[PDB]
Amino acid sequence: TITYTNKVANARLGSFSSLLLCWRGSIYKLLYGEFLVFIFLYYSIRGLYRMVLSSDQQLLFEKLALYCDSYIQLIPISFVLGFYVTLVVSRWWSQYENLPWPDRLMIQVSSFVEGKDEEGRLLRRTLIRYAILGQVLILRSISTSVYKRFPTLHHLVLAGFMTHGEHKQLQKLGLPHNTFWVPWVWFANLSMKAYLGGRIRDTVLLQSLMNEVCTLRTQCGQLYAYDWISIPLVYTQVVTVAVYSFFLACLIGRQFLNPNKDYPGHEMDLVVPVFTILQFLFYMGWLKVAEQLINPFGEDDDDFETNWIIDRNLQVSLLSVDGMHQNLPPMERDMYWNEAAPQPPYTAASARSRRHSFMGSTFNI
Amino acid sequence: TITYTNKVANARLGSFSSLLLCWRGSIYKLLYGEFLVFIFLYYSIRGLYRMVLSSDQQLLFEKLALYCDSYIQLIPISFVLGFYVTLVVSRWWSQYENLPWPDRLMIQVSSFVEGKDEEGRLLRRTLIRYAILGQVLILRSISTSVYKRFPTLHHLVLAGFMTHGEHKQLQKLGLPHNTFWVPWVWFANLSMKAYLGGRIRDTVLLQSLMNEVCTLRTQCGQLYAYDWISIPLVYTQVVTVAVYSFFLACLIGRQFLNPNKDYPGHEMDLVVPVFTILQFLFYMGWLKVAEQLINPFGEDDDDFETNWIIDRNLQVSLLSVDGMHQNLPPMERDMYWNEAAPQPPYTAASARSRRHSFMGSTFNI
Amino acid sequence: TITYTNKVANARLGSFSSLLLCWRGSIYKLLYGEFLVFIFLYYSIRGLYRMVLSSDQQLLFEKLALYCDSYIQLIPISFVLGFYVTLVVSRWWSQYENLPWPDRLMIQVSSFVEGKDEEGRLLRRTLIRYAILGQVLILRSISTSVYKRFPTLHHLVLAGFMTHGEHKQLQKLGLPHNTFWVPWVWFANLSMKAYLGGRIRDTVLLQSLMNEVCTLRTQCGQLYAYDWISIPLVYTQVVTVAVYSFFLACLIGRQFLNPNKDYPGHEMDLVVPVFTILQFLFYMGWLKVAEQLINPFGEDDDDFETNWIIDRNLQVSLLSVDGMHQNLPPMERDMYWNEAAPQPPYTAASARSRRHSFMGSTFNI
Amino acid sequence: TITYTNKVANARLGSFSSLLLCWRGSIYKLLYGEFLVFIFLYYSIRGLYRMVLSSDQQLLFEKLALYCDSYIQLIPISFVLGFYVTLVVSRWWSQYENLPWPDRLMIQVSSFVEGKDEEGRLLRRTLIRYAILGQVLILRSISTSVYKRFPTLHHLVLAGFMTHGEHKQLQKLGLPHNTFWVPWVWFANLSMKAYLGGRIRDTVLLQSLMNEVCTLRTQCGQLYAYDWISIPLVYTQVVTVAVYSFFLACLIGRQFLNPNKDYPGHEMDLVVPVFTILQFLFYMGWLKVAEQLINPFGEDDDDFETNWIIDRNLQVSLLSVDGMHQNLPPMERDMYWNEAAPQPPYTAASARSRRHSFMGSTFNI
Amino acid sequence: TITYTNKVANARLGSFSSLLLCWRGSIYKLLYGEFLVFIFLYYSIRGLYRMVLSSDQQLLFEKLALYCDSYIQLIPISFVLGFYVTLVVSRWWSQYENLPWPDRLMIQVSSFVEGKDEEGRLLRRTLIRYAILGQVLILRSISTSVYKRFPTLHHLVLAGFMTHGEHKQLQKLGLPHNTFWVPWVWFANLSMKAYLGGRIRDTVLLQSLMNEVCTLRTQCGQLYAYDWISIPLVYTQVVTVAVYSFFLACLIGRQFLNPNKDYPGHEMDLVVPVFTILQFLFYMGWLKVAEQLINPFGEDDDDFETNWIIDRNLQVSLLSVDGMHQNLPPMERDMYWNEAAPQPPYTAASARSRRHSFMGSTFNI
Ligand SMILES: [Ca+2]
Ligand SMILES: [Ca+2]
Ligand SMILES: [Ca+2]
Ligand SMILES: [Ca+2]
Ligand SMILES: [Ca+2]
Ligand SMILES: [Cl-]
Ligand SMILES: [Cl-]
Ligand SMILES: [Cl-]
Ligand SMILES: [Cl-]
Ligand SMILES: [Cl-]
Ligand SMILES: [Cl-]
Ligand SMILES: [Cl-]
Ligand SMILES: [Cl-]
Ligand SMILES: [Cl-]
Ligand SMILES: [Cl-]
Structure with missing residues (x-):
């Protein structure tokens, strides 16, 4: 498992933004393999369109690109992702x-x-x-x-x-x-x-x-x-198809067309798509969460460490049942034997945590 | 039931994409019957429109098609599907x-x-x-x-x-x-x-x-x-009507009209609809999930195998209560009799799972 | 209650589509009363507009109709319906x-x-x-x-x-x-x-x-x-108002206006609204679900049958505590007295349910 | 508390529509105070714009109104309302x-x-x-x-x-x-x-x-x-800000501008806004639900009556533990002493509730 | 912790609107640090565009701004925020x-x-x-x-x-x-x-x-x-990226461009963005909720006070087990010794809480 609890104890100027530089068990590590395929396909298609195709083929490609872009209507990927992930997370914690x-x-x-x-x-x-x-x-x-x-x-x-x-x-x-x-x-x-x-x-x-x-x-x-008994293959396949068709439509349909035809929306040419890569990162990490958590007993980074608790349990139980049968420390009068209101001391670094007892919301009304 | 847990233990380049080639208990198997009806109706309507109808009837059909397409506004099929499926899944697990x-x-x-x-x-x-x-x-x-x-x-x-x-x-x-x-x-x-x-x-x-x-x-x-006591028929019928009206509207309204009238959106003619079949697959698998899970005790592929546990239980209980009444192995001193800190060995293939004990998030602050 | 569990055991070509022909405890039975009022109001308004109003009044009506149609923006009826129905269903099952x-x-x-x-x-x-x-x-x-x-x-x-x-x-x-x-x-x-x-x-x-x-x-x-203690009247009234205002806006605003003014969207005249009736059915059944389930102890069709279990319980308990005090069948050696691996026979019609025991996901890796 | 359970036992022609005439514990009672402020501000702003402002100031106001109306994009008020209300309702029932x-x-x-x-x-x-x-x-x-x-x-x-x-x-x-x-x-x-x-x-x-x-x-x-321990003030303030900014934008931005400039959308002038008041009612009752239920022990109408159960409990417990220690009615043979199948009679008004016992879904297949 | 329960007991004219003036544990306190960075970046970019850039560079900036604004399509920030916050709140209460x-x-x-x-x-x-x-x-x-x-x-x-x-x-x-x-x-x-x-x-x-x-x-x-075991870093990073890309797109894309080019939407120039700051407040408080509640044992304002209950518990247990072993008050006849129907008195200020016992919903039908 990955433990970052000590890093998010308090809310500061950068608390959730300094976690984006982590490498182990992160979206970058999980998607380095599949980002390259997407980039290679995108650039190959762009090069083919801009060098191999003739004028009529380019016009046909532009018409097909508009037809394709008309179908990125946010098909309920944002719904299935989340209605599936909540179930996956609940199963993970119950496991x-x-x-x-x-x-x-x-x-x-x-x-x-x-x-x-x-x-x-x-x-x-x-x-x-x-x-x-x-x-x-x-x-x-x-x-x-x-x-x-x-x-x-x-x-x-x-x-x-x-x-x-x-x-x-x-x-x-x-x-x-x-x-x-x-x-x-x-x-x-x-x-x-x-x-x-x-x-x-x-x-x-x-x-x-x-x-x-x-x-x-x-x-x-x-x-x-x-x-x-596992999550239904029908549900898993539905989510996978819904996610993959989105980027299939994006590949041909989110390309910078020629600006000489006064197309409604395609006006400037950029070398790389900036707001498509961010969408890829977001919509693919949302799926990699479920991909990682679908089986908690594996060899990922955010997976349970079951090899440590077959030894910790053995040592602890064997020591407890054998070396500590009826061996207990002596009984002596404590520090507050004659005091009815014990007052443990407070350190200098924790003196701001002193508070009065809560005596009900209806007090002093 | 279908068990694919051993195939999704780790997140790899293809983990959720190699599950799309499965046939048993999948969307393809569940929808082979109802994809043919949709395709046949679509092509029959297209052929009738493109061969039988005259000019005035074609104009009327085009006007009706625009009117129909105006009504695919994503009626909350994406909501009822999911608000129904969560309840179905919860009932399945509770069963x-x-x-x-x-x-x-x-x-x-x-x-x-x-x-x-x-x-x-x-x-x-x-x-x-x-x-x-x-x-x-x-x-x-x-x-x-x-x-x-x-x-x-x-x-x-x-x-x-x-x-x-x-x-x-x-x-x-x-x-x-x-x-x-x-x-x-x-x-x-x-x-x-x-x-x-x-x-x-x-x-x-x-x-x-x-x-x-x-x-x-x-x-x-x-x-x-x-x-x-089953899920209300009113709720089931509401979901079914909401799903079916969507494709009824798609049939007449997602057809490639004549591009000689400069219609706003219909510009290129394709032989087959590519992004309608994907929507059909997604929106119909999302319903087939509930159709399969509405009764876990049946003869589907993702249904409980209750015929195995009336025999496993019988054999196990009969053996346990009769042949193992007070027959237990001899008691001998174990390997860690004189060692207070047992250290079981680690194999070469699992030497990377060695970890130190977690001693609290507040350690070393 | 209504039991259709035996009809949805398996997923077939028509499983959820043959349930639309049921009459008892269905949307048609629950909305026959309130569909007539909607149809009568719609047709009365249409007749008044198309016969009584003069030219200036017709122009004013058209402007008001466009203003009204601008306000069907899917106000979160699809949200309140569902966030209310989930709570209603949970309360029903808990009851x-x-x-x-x-x-x-x-x-x-x-x-x-x-x-x-x-x-x-x-x-x-x-x-x-x-x-x-x-x-x-x-x-x-x-x-x-x-x-x-x-x-x-x-x-x-x-x-x-x-x-x-x-x-x-x-x-x-x-x-x-x-x-x-x-x-x-x-x-x-x-x-x-x-x-x-x-x-x-x-x-x-x-x-x-x-x-x-x-x-x-x-x-x-x-x-x-x-x-x-019941569901708050404020919440119930909010849901009712949200649902009713939608159809109030639809009545004046989803009418077929004159096509002689080249209006942007109103082009063809149909005698009856086909895609408004379907929306009425869907959005009204989604509310009739909660209307039926708000009190499970009533005289509806999908309501608990509490008059059967005051008699079943009485008969069963009286027979169990009196006629079966210590009257039990004789004890005899069973069929598997000398067999450690009982093998009950399988019928011809259920020979396809034979399966091997599951021995863990990690087997044979 | 308010009990209307006896009024919604069955689904009729008017079941949820006759609850809109209630006054105690309703949206009208909860919002009579804050509807007047909204109406007064709206009409004051309208009068100022239509009488005090000159031509250039009127043009500036129109431009600002279009800019404001561009920002009513349904900011996720419909999401925070509902994701907050579900938690509030769960806490209420758990309390x-x-x-x-x-x-x-x-x-x-x-x-x-x-x-x-x-x-x-x-x-x-x-x-x-x-x-x-x-x-x-x-x-x-x-x-x-x-x-x-x-x-x-x-x-x-x-x-x-x-x-x-x-x-x-x-x-x-x-x-x-x-x-x-x-x-x-x-x-x-x-x-x-x-x-x-x-x-x-x-x-x-x-x-x-x-x-x-x-x-x-x-x-x-x-x-x-x-x-x-109460719901976080950050969450409460976020919901309040999200709700209030919506109506702040509506005030200047949902006004009937002059129709002499051929503006795209503002064509007819109405004295009062009809579809803004309904949105106010809906979006404000959805918040008043949480406002009422945030503290169940108060002096509202839909609040627990804790002053009745400190007396009911006292009387019942004192009577039970003192006057009924071992005072029980005599033991006599009941009516079904010699009958193994008791059959209690049915009245004429409840003769339609007779039913046969349910013997499994697999019967007669 | 912060206790405001006594302030929201009843629903009044201002109940949720008087909580916006609080400073301790509020959105203003949590976002004072990160509002300044956003404002500084916005104004620096605006000044650079309006003074340093030449005509061609200004045209390029305008084209890029339109391209950027086309990508604020409400990417499912409103979904991940809320599907993440519900889990965080559930974990907080369970902790x-x-x-x-x-x-x-x-x-x-x-x-x-x-x-x-x-x-x-x-x-x-x-x-x-x-x-x-x-x-x-x-x-x-x-x-x-x-x-x-x-x-x-x-x-x-x-x-x-x-x-x-x-x-x-x-x-x-x-x-x-x-x-x-x-x-x-x-x-x-x-x-x-x-x-x-x-x-x-x-x-x-x-x-x-x-x-x-x-x-x-x-x-x-x-x-x-x-x-x-903490919430997955993949999920946390996905939410953070989704939230941050929104404001990154807003910075360049929600700026007041020159109104001399008749751009479709940019018509009036305002010194400060009013409806962008409100969106920042809302969408950033919705994330600060999770940032605060991700670790309940810290030094925030809405964090558990664990230093008070190690002393309260000690004092209470030591007093209970030592000074009150078998020291109990004398047993005397109470006030209602001879009365079977005790009637405790009601004060003048609480005389409106008198109610009759509830005797079932079926009474008087
Ligand atoms: Ca794993
Ligand atoms: Ca089944
Ligand atoms: Ca009922
Ligand atoms: Ca209250
Ligand atoms: Ca904290
Ligand atoms: Cl892009
Ligand atoms: Cl434990
Ligand atoms: Cl298509
Ligand atoms: Cl078990
Ligand atoms: Cl219609
Ligand atoms: Cl039982
Ligand atoms: Cl209005
Ligand atoms: Cl009780
Ligand atoms: Cl702005
Ligand atoms: Cl306690």
Whole structure:
């Protein structure tokens, strides 16, 4: 992803105008390839018209150019672009929201699963690894970079994400479906086995551990559904045709004709079209937005970095469930033990943020 | 459904332009039937005007053509198309979201319902079959392909989805309503009977099993409501009339008139209209999107495949609740037993995805 | 309601064009009354202008007609229509979603309230009737057809929905408010009395029965709030004025003037306006959509049928809680007892729906 | 509020046209003040131009009028109006949805808190009063009419909403913040004290009573946040400027110039502008909608009536928790004791609402 | 933030027009910097054209000006502005909704954690401080003013937010990630340690305390995700280019040319452009709205005041959990002990708000 939040915190003289000099993940980078084709076609057509064509052919070309220019009536490109982009953006954000974070579950596991010794450490670590395995499987199934990192199920064993016995057990199912649901069943069985013992005190703490697992499974299923079902090809093709016909009409129809015929509108000759390139930039970036965001799990610049959160999650959960089981700092009286109105100090650089409490809009009326 | 997600992962020189060569589920396939009628009518009218009509009739036709062309003012077809399509797309996605998956329930059943023997296997299998029966009934009642697969309730018995005794009991209700609610009551009664015994330990694990059933019933009811109540016929007819009047006006009014009368706009004669066919394609695909998505459970190409998930669900649930009751892989120390900072390896092809953790936008200011 | 879902399952040559021949709940039925007034006014004005007016008055009328036609600039009727209709449609669907169905509650009552004898049957039936009484009261208070069916509270006693003692107890409250909240309090008291006894085993099954009642009460309150608070009259009047001024300007300003004055645009005389009637149809159906959907509980064709679900609910709940308390079919081994990969058969007519499971978008890259 | 729902139940010949004769809460009432200023300015400018100005000044005025009229190009007033009004309407409805109703809580209190005597009646009444006190405090802090009714905290004591001891305890906190959170803490403490005794049976019924309190607190906090944070002044000022510049340009630029100069468009002189007043009405009502709905808690006509629900809630809750503790009507066999298919009768006036049950869209294909 | 809610409670003659005189947080304040550049460029270009250029160069400039003015066709600036601003506003409100308030948690802690003595006071205070520490950490990581107030983790110790032992324990983790998740694990461990003792009665009151912590963690994670992932740079750059090209075209193309050439449209010379400055104001404020709201945690005027709620929360929670453990006012009979229909009095200034209860729309039909 690209983070420019620290650059637009305040509104200044140049805030949105200094972002036009960026190169990574920008319209210039996305359209360098397709601007050259447009320029080459435009100049080839202009040269052919101005050198090869004779007088009668030039007259025919001028008549065709007027006929073509009559059809740039702003066909609802400005409508389909925007009615399509809003849906694309909504789908993009909804796809982000269904990323599984085992933070609501590592806390519960570490707090509830008792026993500071072996056979308790092993149980907690296995329980927390079974949750990461499912997210790894679904992310590998839906993400190109994660698939490149783990092309085969043996790479998961080699990387320590799962054991040889687990791989052998997974291979012995004999089902022609994605096996991204097995770790949740393993988690449920292990939790019940742990309850049948001295490691879980009550059944009220066991119906709370098997309630975050259901939510994680639902989120993984939503991710899989988003990957499986895509925006209709009919809608995508309609938008593409509407955008491309505009520039096809512009190519022959926005050319500087001869000014010796007193044509109504074509009066001066310019070497390059200045206000056509700007329209190209605008109307093509508006489409490149959707082109980039149609699949958030890829290798673009504005795409989710799913290879960082399979390691951050692993490290954080393993540290939380093992090294911080019941190791907490000492309890001491705080600074405001005898004061009912604490007043934390203010620094010199942040003294202008002092404000009085808001006491309702109806105060002093 | 049509899946092209793997083809649009990255933005390239041609990403949205190589999708115009697809045939299955595309505008060309959807409009091959209705393009011929338009072309035939256009050419018949042109031939009649240019051969049959005399001079006075030709003058009258020209005056009528100018009057007609004055009325292509972009009547808000570009508005109704889009204000209708957004609603259609929202309804389509909401219809998808209410598909029942018994994954949150098979886990709970397998974990909680105890007993690895007969009378435990039978109880678990019956409990998990009662949930699939209701989804099968509602899907058969709302889906054409599923109805074609199961035209009669005896086909369900023949296919193993339910037993002869269950069919006889269902036939003895005597109610003039859809019987898609009985299996949930059967599930509740069987769960209570199982609790009245040694197969469910506590009442906290029985109020958790009868809480996923309520959610599944709500989802089935939402599906039935979506099937029963449709988008208003008034709105559909308004959109259809608005779209059709546009091309009716185009037919007589976008014809190449005689250029001997110095008409203001009609100057050159072309054999075929190039910029009318493109408008037809765009404005008709924008309507075919809604025509396709108005009923997601059909036999189109971009329609839900409900015949695959009545078998995937059955196989997965039956395997999970029976063959994996408390069969889990052995517990062994993992690779990172003594390391507090695990570092999984990176492959050569995915070495460019290495990134540092994000530590807030306010860092280093 | 009008159901045409079975007619638009697939996209064919004529799918949206065969819906224009429907009469019930259509634009023709909704506008037959107001098309005649428009036609009569148009023809009366035309006859007056063409017969009564003299030469100077005709010249003045022509000047006024040009001035009027200059003001049909598509004032944002196409905007307010659509920005109003989207809100109306959202409110309509939200009003539908808050219809109370006692399916999540009849299951719990039948499963939990124990005792197959008298004083158990009576308790279950009273508990399930108290829930239907509240929905009947709110629906009668908000629906015209239901009020016509039950004009007085004595009709409820006559129809068996409540008892004479219940009516006498309800009459002795002395409050100037709608008494649609009493049955929920009665339900809570009866449930607590049943718990204080042998009919409810635990308090975990009593906090689950008094949690669906709260949701039903919330849904009824939302229905009452939707009935009480309506779309602002200012917004409705703005839309109505914007729509009506358009046709007021069209009446005088879209008339065929004399072609002897070489006017710029008026060249040919037609007996009837063809492209004005189509605009009338479109711009008036777009408003009749909101006119119909502004109150879903009425006597239109596209209005909710609330008189069917006060009887369906009653029959279904009474049968479920009484005749199916713990009567369930026998438990027998199913067809796939010894098979780990069930394969239900496919019919000849549905053999084209066979598909392979989707295994991720990243497969085979 | 204004309720016209009973007037628009069905679509008739005049349904939306008979609402234009209403005076209370209408565009005429909202714009009577500002129509006079516009008319006076228009006529003063016209009189000055037609009497005071000489020939050269008149020519200059005509040139300026053409220049001004060239700038009425429908600047996106039709866009900002509507993109602003949708947000305003959404905020209005969301503000309504967060009104606290203690109906989910009075039921639980009356059902669970046991003891029909003194020290039980007192406890229930105090528990139900602590909930109303917080809603009264927040509504007084955010609503002008409620503040006018209760200008001082002593008025609450005088009106019986709280006791002298409660007022003295509230005055002894010494915090410079709104004290709308204290009653919830008092409720929690009183509930725990009641549990530490014989009035609450289990801790499962105490975690259910302290779960509605959290929801009520969240709703009150949302109301306070909506009051505190408003729509940006930049956006409001942008909309106001865009609307006002339109009529500023209309004033000088939509005047009837002299027809002796053969100007292109100004041909006939009318005493009053007919199609300018209609545009004023439409474009000004579209803004008065947002002006009215920007603060739902005021003294307009289409504003929430918060002074009725501080009394309705009090009476209803006090009656429910005290006079109906365990007083319920007798249990008797209903009318359909021996009938499995109840058939309630239909009246003559509602005999046309009889319908058959819907059995799926796939039936009979 | 800027609060003007008390000024727009009612709709008056001037309600939205008296807000144009505000200076703080307004379009004038936001555009004073960039209006001068536009004016200077315009006047420099005008002076150069009218003094430096010769006759032929002036003719070329006039031809270029007509060519430029032909390209102000309202390129969809009015569309992108609004389709971008709606998304920005939605993100802004969603960012506000995820602010953690420990009001649902301080109530539960004070009510449930028993013991009015030392080792109970210490436990409650530590439990309530661990929750504030996490919100302080995330707010410091995402907010510029909070970072300025607390530039280093030692400032938190100096300000009393955490202890030296806690700082030393936090420093000994050795992870390259944001440590905003540790306090939640500490809270869970401390809660379990408290349960293992006499301070928590049941496990039903311990699964309720560790359920608000999960919600607070989810809200903090959502805030962090919103900070990390921003609106695409492609979309921002597209909007900026579309807005800037409009005024670039206006600069050369909206100038008063010589009126001696009878140009079609340029007839009168004005010293300053009046209707260009208004367009600048409108089209630039519409963009400054998004420029301001793109990062709600900054130092603008319409930005969240996060430095007030780290102190309000601290004071309120510390007072609630310590000084109000089980200190509640005495229980006495209220004013309406013997009255079933309480009637609170109405003041003279609020006597016009008396209304009758709404009894359904179907009443009296
Ligand atoms: Ca991508
Ligand atoms: Ca279909
Ligand atoms: Ca209706
Ligand atoms: Ca108001
Ligand atoms: Ca900011
Ligand atoms: Cl799922
Ligand atoms: Cl150009
Ligand atoms: Cl349902
Ligand atoms: Cl053509
Ligand atoms: Cl309610
Ligand atoms: Cl006509
Ligand atoms: Cl809050
Ligand atoms: Cl006028
Ligand atoms: Cl999170
Ligand atoms: Cl100007």
